[PDB]
Every structure is written in C-alpha cells, then in structure tokens.
Amino acid sequence: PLGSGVPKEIQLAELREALLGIPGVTGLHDLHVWSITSGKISLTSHLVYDPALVDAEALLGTVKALLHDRYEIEHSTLQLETSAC
Amino acid sequence: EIQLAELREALLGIPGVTGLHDLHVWSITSGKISLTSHLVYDPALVDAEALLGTVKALLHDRYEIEHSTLQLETSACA
Ligand SMILES: [Zn+2]
Ligand SMILES: [Zn+2]
Ligand SMILES: [Zn+2]
Ligand SMILES: [Zn+2]
Ligand SMILES: [Zn+2]
C-alpha cells in the first residue's frame, strides 16, 4: 500500500495506524521508510509495547509478518521498549 | 545467477523428499525469480504441510523467491 516511488506521508499515516493497531503496541516514534533500489523498501522504527499484554519476541514476529506480507518489506529494524525515549 | 544443479541437490537434500521433476525456474526483467516443481515425498517420514513450510523457507531465505508453486505427491507422475 506504499506503492512504487517515494512513499507519501498519508501512506505512512496508514502504516502508523497498522502498527499502532497491533495488540500490545502502545506507542510509535522515529519511523524511517526509504527505497535503496527500485522496488525494495526498508523500515526502521521504535515500538512502545505493554509487557503485561505481549511478549517482545512474539510482538517482533507479528510486526515482521505484517511488514513482509502486507507492505513487501524484507529489510526492517525495530527497537521494542516498555517506555518511550 | 542460480545454479539449477545445486538447487536440485538442495531440494533433494531436505529430509522426507524422495524425488523431484518438472522443475521450472524463470526471471521477469524486474529481477524477481519464480519457481514451480513437483516434489515426491515419503508420508511416513514427513507431513505435507510441514515439508511445504520447509521448502518455502529454503526458496525464500536462500534464493529470494516470493512466487512459487510446489506439487507435493507420494508417488512420481508417469
Ligand atoms: Zn530517526
Ligand atoms: Zn520475502
Ligand atoms: Zn524510542
Ligand atoms: Zn514442465
Ligand atoms: Zn509429478
């Protein structure tokens, strides 16, 4: 849903909602989405989660699946934390 | 570039796989690589769904193949 070419801020807005919509996720900041080559899209982000609701390793698996299966993102780096920076 | 001989060995090297035929590997000009194949397996040794998962992982993680169609069968085609 980010399409070919430079991702728009309104497509990133929908990507933010998708990540914030995952059970256990409380927060989201320092989102980076860019294209290195034609087609390939990379993502880095900080994710704030409730450790009482979801396990870190489990949440990481759920986010990787969403980013890969929906957005076709192979190359991602996600910092999971219990409180925002 | 993919070595098909080495790809065949990799698939035949998976525990439970007894046979391999009708292998198709081709590239569209965007670079994306597709694969179709018939895979003969021993149902006493491995579960179909489990084997399918193992083959998809190999094709994705080693060969960067997203687009694949694999026919799992307990005996080879005539
Ligand atoms: Zn940043
Ligand atoms: Zn992939
Ligand atoms: Zn942070
Ligand atoms: Zn054929
Ligand atoms: Zn066959």
Side-chain angles (χ1 to χ4, degrees), chain A residues 1-39 41-85, chain B residues 1-31 33-48 50-78:
Chain A
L2 297 175
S4 296
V6 56
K8 293 198 174 72
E9 187 63 17
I10 201 70
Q11 293 166 340
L12 292 185
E14 176 273 332
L15 171 60
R16 279 184 204 99
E17 286 305 309
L19 291 168
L20 289 168
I22 295 171
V25 175
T26 59
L28 170 49
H29 59 272
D30 199 46
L31 181 61
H32 292 273
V33 188
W34 74 98
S35 303
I36 299 162
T37 189
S38 185
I41 35 169
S42 303
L43 183 149
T44 76
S45 183
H46 294 214
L47 275 174
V48 192
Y49 76 97
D50 195 334
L53 296 181
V54 71
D55 180 51
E57 198 68 36
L59 176 53
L60 188 61
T62 307
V63 176
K64 291 283 172 187
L66 177 64
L67 292 181
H68 180 273
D69 295 346
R70 186 175 167 77
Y71 292 101
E72 307 164 3
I73 298 172
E74 297 296 334
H75 179 260
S76 68
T77 302
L78 295 153
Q79 182 170 303
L80 276 50
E81 50 202 33
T82 55
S83 56
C85 300
Chain B
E1 279 295 342
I2 300 173
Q3 294 284 347
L4 290 186
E6 294 180 10
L7 172 60
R8 278 189 256 263
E9 285 176 305
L11 290 168
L12 288 168
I14 295 170
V17 175
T18 59
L20 170 51
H21 59 272
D22 199 47
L23 180 61
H24 292 276
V25 190
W26 74 99
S27 183
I28 60 171
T29 41
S30 67
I33 310 170
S34 303
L35 185 148
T36 77
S37 183
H38 294 214
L39 275 173
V40 193
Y41 76 98
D42 195 333
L45 296 181
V46 71
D47 181 51
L51 175 53
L52 188 60
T54 307
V55 176
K56 291 283 177 186
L58 174 63
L59 294 181
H60 180 273
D61 295 346
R62 186 176 162 182
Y63 291 102
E64 307 188 54
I65 298 173
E66 298 296 338
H67 182 258
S68 67
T69 301
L70 294 154
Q71 182 170 303
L72 276 51
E73 50 201 32
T74 55
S75 56
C77 296

